[PDB]
């Protein structure tokens, strides 16, 4: 929040592919502005493009200091992916008893 | 008068929006029965 | 005109002759208009920004 304040945007406007995903503020170690959307195909218009190895969730964020924009449009083309293979194990030891 | 006009710089709705529309609502008035010219200041 | 509408009032006269002798006919007619209306350009607008 401090960085964007210095950038000259008094109040920033957080918008995904859908406007209902308006961002909010939260504090963990500093003043942060953040947006939260599920990891699924389209609840906030997030595209799922899955290849044989990974599946990524792609959506774009929009930055502005006003409801209307007149110059320097901002497009945060973000996407994070997940693999489809993984290794898991019980954490309890087993000890069989036999005759 | 019977015609109203105004001009403004072009903008864009910040967001996933690419088209802009305009909608005005008009109210006629009597040129004599009341004062129609509106004046505002900050 | 009242606050909301303005009406135009006039009366019509019916007769089969220049002079009337019975059953005078008066058609009291008037149609009105509101003072508010909604308009929307039929032209789509598309901005282009950096
Ligand atoms: C199936 O889809 C997956 C998911 O996208 C894809 O894996 C991706 O591979 C590409 C191609 O290499 C990676 O693209 C990145 O491109 C630049 C360099 O050109 C860098 O950002 C990345 O390298 C970084 O790797 C590490 C990441 O921290 C660091 O060592 C360092 O930052 C490097 O710069 C990378 O090359 C993309 O990141 C991956 N995504 C992953 C691994 O999650 C996969 O290739 C696709 N399979 C196909 C098309 O067969
Ligand atoms: C300002 O003046 C305007 C113009 O006269 C006025 O609107 C009028 O309101 C009156 C009162 O309601 C209407 O009088 C009519 O009276 C009879 C029933 O008593 C009916 O003819 C009308 O109802 C009809 O409404 C619809 C018309 O098609 C139909 O559903 C159907 O025919 C109904 O019967 C109506 O009540 C008069 O018609 C209106 N004029 C309109 C609607 O153009 C307004 O109320 C005044 N405002 C004030 C005094 O603040």
Curated annotation (Swiss-Prot), chain A:
Coiled coil: none
Annotated organism of origin: Homo sapiens (Human)
Region (ZP-N) location: 1-84
Cellular compartment(s): Apical cell membrane; Basolateral cell membrane; Cell projection, Cilium membrane
Record region (Flexible ZP-N/ZP-C linker): 85-99
Disease: Tubulointerstitial kidney disease, autosomal dominant 1: A form of autosomal dominant tubulointerstitial kidney disease, a genetically heterogeneous disorder characterized by slowly progressive loss of kidney function, bland urinary sediment, hyperuricemia, absent or mildly increased albuminuria, lack of severe hypertension during the early stages, and normal or small kidneys on ultrasound.
Tissue expression as described in the entry: Expressed in the tubular cells of the kidney. Most abundant protein in normal urine (at protein level). Synthesized exclusively in the kidney. Expressed exclusively by epithelial cells of the thick ascending limb of Henle's loop (TALH) and of distal convoluted tubule lumen.
Glycan-bearing residues: 51
Gene behind this protein: UMOD
Disulfide bonds: 21-44
Recorded consequence of changing residue 76 to K: Abolishes polymerization and filament formation of the secreted form
Residues of the full protein shown: 346 to 444 of 640
Lineage: Eukaryota, Metazoa, Chordata, Craniata, Vertebrata
Modification after translation: N-glycosylated. Other complex glycosylation sites may serve as binding sites for proteins from other bacteria inclduding K.pneumoniae, P.aeruginosa and S.mitis. Proteolytically cleaved at a conserved C-terminal proteolytic cleavage site to generate the secreted form found in urine. This cleavage is catalyzed by HPN.
Stated name of the protein: Uromodulin
Domain remark in the UniProt entry: The ZP domain mediates polymerization, leading to the formation of long filaments. The core of the filament consists of interlocked ZP domains which assemble into a helical structure. Each ZP domain consists of an N-terminal (ZP-N) and C-terminal (ZP-C) region connected by a flexible linker; the linker allows the ZP domain to wrap around the ZP-C subdomain of the preceding subunit. The heavily glycosylated N-terminal part of the protein (containing several EGF-like domains) forms branches which protrude from the core and are involved in pathogen capture.
Effect after changing residue 90 to S: Impairs polymerization and filament formation of the secreted form
């Amino acid at each position: 929040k401090c960085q964007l304040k210095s950038l000259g945007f008094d109040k920033v406007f957080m918008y995904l592919s859908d406007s209902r995903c308006s961002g909010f503020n939260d504090r963990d170690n500093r003043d942060w502005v953040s947006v939260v959307t599920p990891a699924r195909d389209g609840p906030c218009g997030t595209v799922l493009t899955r290849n044989e190895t990974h599946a990524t969730y792609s959506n774009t964020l929009y930055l502005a200091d006003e409801i209307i924009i007149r110059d320097l449009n901002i497009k945060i083309n973000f996407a994070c992916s997940y693999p489809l293979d993984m290794k898991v194990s019980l954490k309890t030891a087993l000890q069989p008893m036999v005759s | 008068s019977s015609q109203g006009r105004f001009s403004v710089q072009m903008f864009r709705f910040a967001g996933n929006y690419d088209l802009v529309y305009l909608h005005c609502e008009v109210y006629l008035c009597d040129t004599m029965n009341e004062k129609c010219k509106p004046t505002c200041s900050g």
